[PDB]
Symmetry: D2
Subunit: 211 residues, 4 copies
């Protein structure tokens, strides 16, 4: 499966895809083809693109999932922290993450202070579980940089809205990174639609600079 690594331990993997560029074409005609996709994209006939659908498997920090899951025109199924024992996996920003901000302490110490809290919080979590505290309560001490996993099924129209909002400099850098991988898979599977999207409908800044 197309699997792209994101952040220190994250990823976006493509589980499944229904259709391709021609799925939008046939829906539009209800039945020259590449010019029809450009045409549709240029004039804002977005509905035929709903007949292309993807399922992704995504491993992401909770603070990224939280932003992602705001996209309501999609289907999600996520790892359960109430009944599963949660794995020791946390997003630790690289020193380069703080490139462009003037800091009081070196970026290696910032990375160290994050790692410190993470380790303290996880130990506590494990101590609570061992003492017979239910997992659903014990987990509340875990930080927002804990990794979670989920399935995401989303059609090309909603995906393009996701890319307008997340493959953009105003989105938090971490989700941008996920959106770039989504765009990469989208492009591999639906090249005509992806290029037409960038040319006529894409509202973000980064995908027109990041090849």
């Amino acid at each position: 499966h197309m699997k792209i690594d994101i952040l220190d331990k994250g990823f976006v993997e493509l589980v499944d895809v229904m259709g391709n560029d021609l799925s939008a074409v046939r829906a539009a005609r209800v039945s020259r083809d590449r010019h029809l996709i450009e045409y549709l994209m240029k004039h804002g006939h977005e509905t035929p693109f709903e007949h292309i659908v993807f399922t992704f498997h995504v491993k992401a920090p909770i603070f990224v999932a939280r932003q992602w899951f705001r996209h309501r025109i999609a289907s999600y199924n996520e790892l359960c922290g109430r009944y599963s024992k949660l794995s020791y996996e946390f997003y630790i920003p690289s020193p380069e993450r703080l490139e462009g901000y003037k800091t009081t302490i070196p970026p290696e110490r910032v990375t160290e202070k994050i790692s410190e809290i993470v380790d303290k919080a996880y130990r506590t979590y494990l101590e609570l579980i061992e003492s017979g505290v239910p997992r659903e309560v014990a987990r509340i001490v875990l930080p927002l940089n804990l990794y979670t996993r989920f399935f995401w099924t989303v059609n090309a129209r909603s995906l393009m809205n996701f890319l307008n909002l997340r493959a953009d400099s105003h989105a938090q850098w971490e989700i941008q990174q996920y959106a770039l991988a989504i765009a990469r898979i989208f492009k591999e599977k639906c090249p005509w639609t992806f290029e037409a999207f960038l040319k006529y409908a894409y509202k973000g800044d980064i995908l027109k600079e990041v090849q």
Copy 2:
């Protein structure tokens, strides 16, 4: 894959595409038989979100009065033949005499059927005449009756599909869309046998499946 079921006199439901299978729900429930048991468990308890990861595209030819009921299902995608821009074909649902089974009628069912054909023919000829006169199609078509056939593509996931079958695969629904819902059910069954059996066994609220 590909399946086509003919409905009414000139209608059809055709399966254009599918994403996933019964294991797509299982994979999703688990974020990846014990697997068949899981599908039944999900169905039994109304854990329906996993079934959203199974997706169908259908191509449907149905009368307008059927499509109008159908398109009330908002959790889906539609693209439909455009009467504003295309010259519309002479195809109309004429009920067979058997459609009036049960109903004691004043005129024999054949005459009912013939009365329907005649008004339809008259409406269509007027439509054509207006078009020949230079009347925009979007105006001319307003004389056409609700039994005119339209075509559309329908993309729907298994969860929304089960909602559709609950409502339309049911005696309280009009006979004509019931017939379509039976074709939708048969294709669903072919492609997702486990989910469909579990559905019928545990979740299905209608009465004709």
Copy 3:
């Protein structure tokens, strides 16, 4: 508030939850610089705050119009049942002025007449079928697409602006354009700041800038 549309149609306001401040409260999560914030939300595509303004309309429209209208899925509908009601002798007959700009072979007043004729013969066939013991749900299939229907429509400001982007526009059928113009006027009356910022920043259609 009620606006008559076409020959026998209308759009009336049944209810509204909120006003421009409803969006402001939502965007701030609390409870002019308020009006600056509405324009800020609109200019930047921060549309979700407007979802917390909600209208309910009562609309009487021909079925062909209602079918275009009912394509707008992010809203709630309840329509008159034709399966069990005796349907009312009301049909949209176009004015002769409806064919202005079109050079036709028969007079526009004659087009109008041919439309009423069919309406009348169709309705009479329907009544004949009903009187014969044909169930209404079968008899009504002979009725033309210009038959008037009624529905309740509950829609939020955001979905309403989408609707006006697509329907308050010359590419939409004139008939639904007229209805969209009425929706816009009721929208403007209830939420003038949002309506004004919408027109300035986000509105994609053409006719609301003309009329």
Copy 4:
């Protein structure tokens, strides 16, 4: 109408469009108590749910992130939440009472569970603040914050999607914390739409708690 939930949370009613009769008028498409109340029961009993979509609520809700993350899986509703990338997060966190763990056999007194939870919260928060003073951006500084951090949001939901919410959350299979919130949602729905809430419970409600707990 504002109801306190948990230790620092609440459900507050911001607005409402309609009442029981808004569903009746939608169902009839038309702009008599016993007749109207009968209609509501008939709709609910026969699963004609769509008329209830014409009633709509806006809540202001303050809840811990682990609760918000469950809630926000309800996609047929509208949401605006306070922003952690750009606001300085307030020192407010949910600390379970010892009574939250009564009837779990634990190796330590539930008071020590509270102290343990409270301890990490303080550390995480202190680290967060430490990072902010350093010039680390908030969007990054907050990732050390635990899942019991309180958040606030606006929720706009129609009575239909609200009743779904209650079936699933006003139910003992949902996490106890969200149950508490759902009972508050339910009491407010009941106050504003008594006939629909009662018909709902008699005919349509699949949860277990609203039939045992009054309001």
